[PDB]
Write a protein that binds this DNA or RNA. Sequence first.
RNA 1: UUCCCCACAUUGACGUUCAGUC
RNA 2: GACUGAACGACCAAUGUGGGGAA
Lengths: 396, 397
Amino acid sequence: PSRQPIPSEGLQLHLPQVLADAVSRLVLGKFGDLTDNFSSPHARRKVLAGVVMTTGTDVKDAKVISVSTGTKCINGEYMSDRGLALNDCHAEIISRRSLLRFLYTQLELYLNNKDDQKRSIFQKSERGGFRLKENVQFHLYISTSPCGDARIFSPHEPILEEPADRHPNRKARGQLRTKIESGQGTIPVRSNASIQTWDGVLQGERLLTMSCSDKIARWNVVGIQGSLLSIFVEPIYFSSIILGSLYHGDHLSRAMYQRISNIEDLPPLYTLNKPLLSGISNAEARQPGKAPNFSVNWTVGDSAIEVINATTGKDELGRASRLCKHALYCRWMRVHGKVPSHLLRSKITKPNVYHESKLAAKEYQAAKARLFTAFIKAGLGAWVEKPTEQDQFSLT
Amino acid sequence: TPSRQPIPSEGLQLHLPQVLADAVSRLVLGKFGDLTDNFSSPHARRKVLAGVVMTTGTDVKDAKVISVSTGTKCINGEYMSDRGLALNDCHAEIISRRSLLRFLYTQLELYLNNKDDQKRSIFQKSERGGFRLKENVQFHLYISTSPCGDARIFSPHEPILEEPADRHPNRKARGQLRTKIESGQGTIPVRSNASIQTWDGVLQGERLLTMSCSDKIARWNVVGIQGSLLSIFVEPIYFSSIILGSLYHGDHLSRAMYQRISNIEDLPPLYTLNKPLLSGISNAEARQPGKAPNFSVNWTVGDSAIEVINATTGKDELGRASRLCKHALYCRWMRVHGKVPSHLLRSKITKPNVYHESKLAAKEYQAAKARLFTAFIKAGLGAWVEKPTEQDQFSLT
RNA sequence: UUCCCCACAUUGACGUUCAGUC
RNA sequence: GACUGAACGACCAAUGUGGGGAA
Ligand SMILES: O=P(O)(O)O[C@H]1[C@H](OP(=O)(O)O)[C@@H](OP(=O)(O)O)[C@H](OP(=O)(O)O)[C@@H](OP(=O)(O)O)[C@H]1OP(=O)(O)O
Ligand SMILES: O=P(O)(O)O[C@H]1[C@H](OP(=O)(O)O)[C@@H](OP(=O)(O)O)[C@H](OP(=O)(O)O)[C@@H](OP(=O)(O)O)[C@H]1OP(=O)(O)O
Ligand SMILES: [Zn+2]
Ligand SMILES: [Zn+2]
């Protein structure tokens, strides 16, 4: 029972397993195109992730939106106060950032001219700002379970038709967990209950990053688009989360939403999203060898992939990623300049430092707070954020 | 690399910057080694190491390690002492200064002991009243990493591009005052909408705010390292040098140690904005991420062993007061006051009963302090945070 | 079921040795 | 020097399992 697909909503649009297999084959295949049939220098990977867009039932209308690899987070010495480094390079995190690039591209496409508006996935909303066209869905693929609550118990593959977790009620279950710098495992936040400081980390206090389980759960409440895009667009959710290996429905469902089913008072258009969960027909084999210190990314449209040093958050020549805070802020700023002010979902005007700009997304910020309270009241710990200095920068 | 180069002193340049730096770093680490059975001890475990070195002449081998300390943590608010028996801040550099205070009290006892010891003492009678250092004696601070607070707020693997000379096309402010946030070896900015701390409030569980080391060291670079109480016997004393084992950036460090309050005005006689030598060392320590020891170690020259304090409680593992707490220092001070004839006092306290009143007798020190606070406010850098007054209402015996 | 103790395992950094590539 | 692999050692603070116990 445990190695079984957990279906989505109350009216079924795709066959669960056909969709699962499809997005798996497509992400894996596109990675193949990008790496000269896995022969490339950076074709080496431990964890692969990607996003697939569907526009209709025609399962051959699927598009690979983004592809990524990576299993590491930035080293503490390398945090950037100018927002030029990538803090978390676990593949699925990277694949969502690549999807952000795609969304900015689509909005820009809409605003470009009238003949392009038909081709863009967005349309004007009656409520102000933009919304996805009626048929458009995104699906997340990870070649393995996201670290934290979905993966920490049962690191192995289930013997199939094996009942769920024998110890479903431990205090440990559902607990928020952090990747800890220079240590393995993912650890409860309740043990590290103080806030992180810039000068604390720089000195040697271990930098904590929220686990991928926790981050995806968050996506299943505030959306995948993030604060900045939420000023233009309505919340966007993944319709499916597909795992190429290590799929445990009990653990995955608990981790992705069920543990915070006590969430209340979400602002309009926000909700606790319960996407299709599924493993695939033929689970991926363990990728042999040492895990690469690099992390690869690609967004549809791009000529090349980009290779980032996960340790440093930058590329081999020390240049900023096209996925860093600063690049995203630049994209956001250009769109912001091209969007008529009667078309903003939030028209509160703030100074042009990153953190202030995110705060302009009042409703998103409120959803985020509902989320945190959900985890706390469910006894699952307080969210751990980056030191506040992280986001105080402007575009020079 | 412009960033990794020494900032020469505005004081007396007696030694060359890099030989001096290498010297005190090597001496403090070596003495810590002596004190910990060659680093094999349990109390050799540390995150930040600090110490003070004294020099007496041009010959850089006349240097003596005055004090050594470790620690990166501060008292938990719930555990404060109303009789002053607990150490509020056990960050290494804070501790090193307090240890140096013990040394100074010893040196006054030395001068006053008899006439033949006066030649051996670092002090001499001052023409202006009270005591002053001999003509050549300097103190140098060593911290194995840049002090928390403003000195550490930067990306060490990114180039410096902080302030242009023409007015920020955006806006100020580098250099904001910062507080140690309880249960942390870290620091956050002081709120502009600043509420003051209360004793029965903090004791209940509310935030204890302790000023960052960057801010305290700046304060030492204006009011001196001796504090209010000693300034009653002695003239203000300053660090001639600040040497860093890591995270050394001349720009940021020069800002934090003095440059950010260069607008200070009306200081009393003998006080000044001290701009000591700033320097990194030749082989810098690497960042060791990992758990921080919960204890803080201290030693002052003359002492047999080190003393080990629980930083959370401010006392040692068996709950005894430190030799560095308010009450201990007040004890030493009172002894000196008893050995000192009253015509030899720099300021006039007559019947010293409670700690705070005794600190207030240091009129000039207090005025310097006020100028400092004002310097920070008018520079747009926030208001200083003081402890509630109940902290200092205690007496001896 | 849950927790305790004990023991055995599992899951990002460090060092050493060896071989490559620019 | 940077990057990169294979073998070996020693950490990391969580999690699993077992025997023994408790509510
Ligand atoms: O999950 P990641 O892709 O690593 O990035 C997120 C993202 O930051 P950026 O998009 O600015 O890089 C979140 O931003 P939102 O779009 O959700 O607002 C931010 O959350 P806050 O804005 O609430 O800080 C969060 O940072 P935090 O650690 O504070 O949650 C941070 O993740 P990392 O800091 O772990 O990269
Ligand atoms: O070594 P520190 O931890 O920085 O101690 C100082 C020191 O107090 P003690 O010498 O009594 O330990 C200051 O006293 P002065 O010697 O400069 O007088 C005092 O400042 P005031 O007594 O002038 O107020 C200040 O306390 P505050 O919090 O009020 O600044 C306090 O720092 P901590 O409170 O951080 O220990
Ligand atoms: Zn992960
Ligand atoms: Zn400090």
